[PDB]
Each structure stands twice: as C-alpha cells, then as structure tokens.
Amino acid sequence: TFYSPKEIFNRLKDSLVPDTGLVTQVWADNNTKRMDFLTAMAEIPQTL
Amino acid sequence: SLWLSFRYEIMPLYYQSQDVLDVIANSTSEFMTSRDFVAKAINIGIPLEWNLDQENLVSQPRHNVMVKSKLSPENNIGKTLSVNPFTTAWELLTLSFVVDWFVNFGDVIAGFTGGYSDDSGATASWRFDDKKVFHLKNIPSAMVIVDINFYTRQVIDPRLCGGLAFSPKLNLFRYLDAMSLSWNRSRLKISRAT
Numbered sequence: 001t002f003y004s005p006k007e008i009f010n011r012l013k014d015s016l017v018p019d020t021g022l023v024t025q026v027w028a029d030n031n032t033k034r035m036d037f038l039t040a041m042a043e044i045p046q047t048l
Numbered sequence: 049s050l051w052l053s054f055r056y057e058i059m060p061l062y063y064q065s066q067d068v069l070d071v072i073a074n075s076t077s078e079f080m081t082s083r084d085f086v087a088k089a090i091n092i093g094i095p096l097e098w099n100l101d102q103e104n105l106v107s108q109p110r111h112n113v114m115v116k117s118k119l120s121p122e123n124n125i126g127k128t129l130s131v132n133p134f135t136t137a138w139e140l141l142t143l144s145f146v147v148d149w150f151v152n153f154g155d156v157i158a159g160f161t162g163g164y165s166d167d168s169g170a171t172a173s174w175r176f177d178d179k180k181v182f183h184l185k186n187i188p189s190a191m192v193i194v195d196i197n198f199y200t201r202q203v204i205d206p207r208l209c210g211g212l213a214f215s216p217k218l219n220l221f222r223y224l225d226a227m228s229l230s231w232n233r234s235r236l237k238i239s240r241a242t
Contacts, residue, residue: 001098001099002096002099002100002182003105005196007197008194009196011105012090012092012107012196013131015090015201016174016202016224018111018113018172018202018204019113019172021086022084022086023082023172023202023212024139026082026113026114026195027082027213028113030081030082030170030214032120034080034117034213034214034216037080037119038214038216038219040075044073044075045161045220045223046230047072047118048072048157048160
C-alpha cells in the first residue's frame with residue numbers, strides 16, 4: 001500500500017514553509033550591500 | 049543691456065544650482081539582489097503498519113529565496129527637475145518667472161529627503177524533484193515508488209517577512225530634512241524682502 005499522489009502533494013503543499021534561516025541570511029546579504037551603497041550617499045546631504 | 053546684465057548675473061549660480069545638484073542627485077538607487085537556496089528535507093511520517101520499510105516520506109527539493117533591492121531614488125520627480133531649457137530667452141524672462149522657477153527648484157530639492165526612500169521587494173521558490181523508492185518490510189521483492197517533480201514560486205510575504213531589513217527610511221529623515229528645512233529663511237530673504 002501507499003498513499004495517493006493527490007494526498008501526497010496535498011501534504012507537500014501543507015509542508016511548504018519558507019526557509020527562515022535562508023530568509024535571514026539573504027536579508028543580511030541585502031542589507032550589507034544596501035548600507036554599502038548608502039555609505040557613498042553620505043556627503044550628498046551636505047552638498048544639498 | 050540691463051536684462052543682458054541680469055542674465056549674466058544669474059547665469060553662474062544657474063550652473064551651481066540646476067546642473068550640479070542634478071548630477072549629485074543622479075547617484076541614487078541601484079539594482080541589487082541577494083540569492084540563496086537550500087536542499088531542505090521535508091518528510092511525512094508514515095506508520096510502519098502502512099506496508100513500508102521506511103516511516104517518513106522524505107523529500108529534498110530545491111528551495112531558493114530571492115531578494116531584490118533597487119533601493120531608492122526620488123519618488124519619480126523627473127520632469128519637474130528635467131525642465132532646464134527655461135534659461136534660453138533672458139531677453140524676455142522677467143524677474144518673477146525666473147525667481148519662481150528657482151523657488152520651486154529649492155522647494156523640490158528640500159523635498160528630496162522625505163520623498164527619497166522607496167526600497168524593493170522579495171520572493172522565494174521551491175523546485176521539487178524527488179523519487180523515493182521504498183522496500184517492503186521482510187519483502188524485498190515488493191516495493192513502493194513515489195516520484196514527485198515540480199517547481200513552485202512564492203512571494204516572501206513582505207508583511208511578516210519581507211521587512212526585517214535595513215529600512216533606509218531611517219538615517220535620512222533624521223538627516224537634513226528637518227535641519228535643511230532651515231532653508232526657509234533663505235527663501236525668506238529671497239522673497240524680495242528681508
């Protein structure tokens with residue numbers, strides 16, 4: 001015996017959960033380069 | 049000759065103001081993204097009475113999380129600043145029209161900071177490709193084969209997740225916007241009085 005593919009895929013989508021660790025990692029990677037760019041912008045306000 | 053002379057008076061500060069400030073503002077926003085993936089294992093517990101050798105329907109898809117950041121320009125001001133040619137007919141431009149152009153320019157320049165931060169979004173995806181073949185307990189000749197293969201994409205849900213970032217809104221409204229707001233005295237002395 002085995003379960004039907006329909007219910008198997010149902011359990012699969014129920015089991016579909018975004019990777020919190022990956023989300024944290026990628027957010028850190030994004031913020032890294034984000035503040036890298038923001039660093040260059042530092043003197044624009046003084047010119048303004 | 050006197051309109052000629054006043055045009056000549058105003059022409060250098062024109063270069064300082066409309067050109068230099070524009071090219072300064074041009075260094076904003078950038079298409080950046082960060083990428084990652086995982087082969088995470090997803091299992092479904094199955095009792096051994098279900099005629100299996102195994103007990104968990106384990107799946108290891110390619111789950112990847114995509115975050116893209118174009119960051120922030122200036123709320124699409126554009127043509128309001130891309131209106132440079134107004135200095136071509138100084139022989140007839142009047143005081144008031146040029147002055148009001150400059151005032152609106154000084155206005156939109158100050159509104160840069162508040163209208164700056166825009167940020168970007170993110171998403172995620174899975175790519176299931178799994179073919180688990182299960183023996184039968186005490187019966188190697190009996191089998192189950194379950195094959196699963198698909199790729200599925202999801203947003204990063206910017207409500208719960210999708211924030212949790214640098215948020216470049218901060219560090220800039222703490223900046224000039226309130227102190228460079230002092231420019232109002234400049235427009236005061238500008239306004240043909242004081």
